[PDB]
């Protein structure tokens, strides 16, 4: 294909996209497919002539759009939202063009000098202790990582180089290996799989800190974790406290875990990939004080500030610890929005979130089993676990609304997270009225 | 943004990407800003305000634009191809709107299920054995990465899993830290620095294979490299094989290297990032013979199989040993190029690869260092390193053409790849001519 027919079929996809967009309330948010649904409906082999375009759109709706979970349709409450913008659509057009591969600065200036001012806009939006900041010859700075788990892993790899060289210069009777089975890392029991894979892959152990009754971490808890570990040979070296954890948006205690982090000689990274965007509002402002006694912070705005996949923003102290353009979707997104339009779509979302807490609050057969602060509430019939997973099932398999749960101690929970760009109060009263009216159902099959 | 407003943007847009690409051969290909010029010219801060679509667009052309290398005009023969290509480009924007992030198959099913099949129409036009295909419930399959390096590296960490159990099966008095610093990993002198990479994540030790004339890994060198460390105590666990190095474009010779590693019980995984894409033509799937012998295979469609980034294609021979519906761009360049119409992009950059040498091939003053099989051409003046240091100089400093130099053993060599998808052989000559002259320049200069 040449630029004039991309001029054609350009524009054909624009109308195609907006006519989804435009309808997706129409669409059942979970598909009906079952494993394997796919390769029966799609040849075996590649075309050796060329298809049209006009097929491969007829099959887009044919047999792809039946397979497809619709994470952007306005009764999606499952996980954690993902960014959708036309603003970073638009970008990514452009990035297809001007974009590469980014691996220096002469590999395309402009890609690095934007990453780099659209990092320093970002950590001012929140804040930022000014020691993050690539700005005015600070020694810290920020740079976008693929996700979060990138983000946690490149935390970890820089704490573990940076311990390794600090025991051989004490003791240089040591080798990698022997300061390798010693190392243990530390993180909340409520923690996102991510960190797990990272000790995984770095090669260390990792060791869960048990969370407060608001599954919160403390310093009493993560002092007696270091009174046991030390005691048995073990070399504390990182850290992931959690704002915003993906079970119960729980935060860790950043002002109490800091400080013992710093007098330890711990790596601090803060992982707050969902909640990090709402603390661009002053009213949540202070979920992340104590953040300034941290070695690295990461957020990602391809969570909840509606930045397209992939954008996660990471800042580091000091730079010298530690490629798609992808600065062209924060520029474009900032610019288009606003600050004032970014806060007012994060404070939409979290009245939602209370506005389902409200009305679970109603029902005496419910629970709300974790302050809701942004836009996420966990909640549950009382009673067994039973009933509890019986209505989930009943949720899932009607596929009008899409929720997950979790686990709190032994205690199975319900999710149901703000995601949508386009939710709204009547999104959120009609699914209630589904949860309310199949909790029915699963109640009555208990006791019958 | 509104999906109203999207439809008028967003054909803006696609029209603002054509005038681009008609009019790029009109822009000068690698930039003259220095490094920090975009900060002075951007504000400071995120907009309050959104500001205008209007306003953003010429920023792009005018302070953007002035710092963008150009990997798409046909006067860029630098690194390696990136790929561009519009039936990429318009998958892409239907990702932006059904795409998620796909960690398991519940997320998105079509997503899951259209990379298996696509992995199997790839590995299938590559004429893989059938070992490596997802298809009639074969154990191996193939999977999408972000990166050859990212591929590499799973590829490492796979290998490490698997060595560690088995030889604390052998001996459970061995920890996995005292296995760490006995196991060593391999590459090539000509490997990409992503092995290296690799290992240090890994935490393992790398160590070069010498290559041979060709700059090709051969039995004789790996087998006095075992010999060594085998008697040193090392262990020998993963073997990166590189078709089509980046320094010179040559092939490790697997079918020498392939039945060593299986008997010494290397994992052997095959890094074909840049040449992967021709082997899809019969006259050149003979550079990957002996692939068969390979426990994991790599090769990126983004760059040279016109699939926008990212898009890095692993095979696996057992997936036990083991996002963004990447799968979807995977499709759409296939079924709008068909095998044929990728047949003849490959032919066309190999045959202007051939017009270059076949220019520098008629200038004495010249010589090509390796043989020429793909779309790569290693040359430079006859002489001292200096002279040819210096042309390097004068032709990047020009900034007509762009190209990258490379060291083969203590020669500093210039390479010239062809990479754009538009560019034809009046391109060629018009860069060899300017290359001659700046030569007779620089040798001018060296006698004077």
Not at 4 to 30: C, H, L, T
Not at 123 to 130: A, I, V
Not at 227 to 256: H, Q, W, Y
């Amino acid at each position: 294909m040449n630029a004039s027919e991309f001029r054609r079929r350009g524009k054909e996809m624009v109308d195609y996209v907006a006519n989804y967009m435009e309808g997706i309330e129409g669409r059942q948010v979970y598909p009906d497919v079952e494993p394997g649904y796919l390769r029966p409906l799609i040849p075996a082999a590649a075309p050796q002539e060329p298809d049209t375009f006009e097929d491969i759109i007829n099959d887009v709706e044919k047999i792809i759009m039946p397979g497809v979970t619709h994470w952007h349709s306005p009764y999606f409450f499952a996980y954690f939202p993902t960014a959708s913008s036309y603003p970073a659509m638009l970008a990514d057009m452009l990035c297809g063009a001007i974009g590469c591969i980014g691996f220096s600065w002469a590999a395309s200036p402009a890609c690095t000098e934007l990453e780099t001012v659209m990092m320093d806009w970002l950590g001012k939006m929140l804040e930022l202790p000014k020691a993050f900041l690539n700005e005015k010859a600070g020694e810290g700075g920020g740079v976008i990582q693929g996700s979060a788990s990138e983000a946690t892993l490149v935390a970890l790899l820089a704490a573990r180089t940076k311990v390794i060289h600090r025991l051989q210069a004490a003791s240089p009777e040591l080798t990698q290996a022997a300061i390798m089975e010693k190392l243990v890392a530390y993180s909340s029991d409520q923690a996102h799989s991510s960190v797990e894979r990272a000790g995984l892959i770095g090669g260390v152990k990792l060791k869960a800190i048990p969370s407060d009754g608001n599954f919160a971490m403390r310093a009493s808890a993560l002092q007696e974790a270091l009174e046991r570990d030390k005691a048995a040979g073990l070399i504390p070296f990182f850290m992931v406290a959690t704002l915003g954890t993906t079970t119960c948006c729980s935060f860790d205690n950043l002002l109490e875990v800091g400080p013992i982090c710093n007098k330890e000689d711990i790596w601090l990274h803060v992982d707050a990939a969902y909640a990090g965007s709402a603390f661009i509002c002053p009213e949540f402002r202070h979920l992340l004080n104590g953040v300034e006694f941290a070695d690295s912070f990461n957020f990602n705005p391809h969570k909840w500030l509606l930045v397209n996949f992939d954008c996660s923003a990471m800042w580091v102290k000091k730079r010298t610890d530690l490629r798609r353009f992808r600065s062209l979707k924060m520029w474009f997104v900032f610019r288009m929005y606003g600050v004032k339009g970014l806060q007012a779509y994060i404070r939409k979302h979290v009245q939602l979130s209370h506005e389902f807490e409200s009305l679970v609050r109603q029902d005496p057969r419910f629970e709300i089993c974790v302050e809701v602060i942004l836009g996420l509430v966990c909640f549950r019939l009382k009673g067994s676990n039973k009933v509890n997973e019986a209505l989930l099932q009943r949720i899932n398999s009607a596929k009008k609304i899409h929720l997950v749960p979790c686990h709190l101690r032994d205690k199975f929970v319900l999710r149901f997270a703000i995601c949508s760009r386009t939710v709204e109060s009547a999104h959120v009263q009609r699914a209630w009225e589904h949860i309310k009216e199949l909790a029915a159902d699963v109640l009555r099959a208990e006791r019958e």
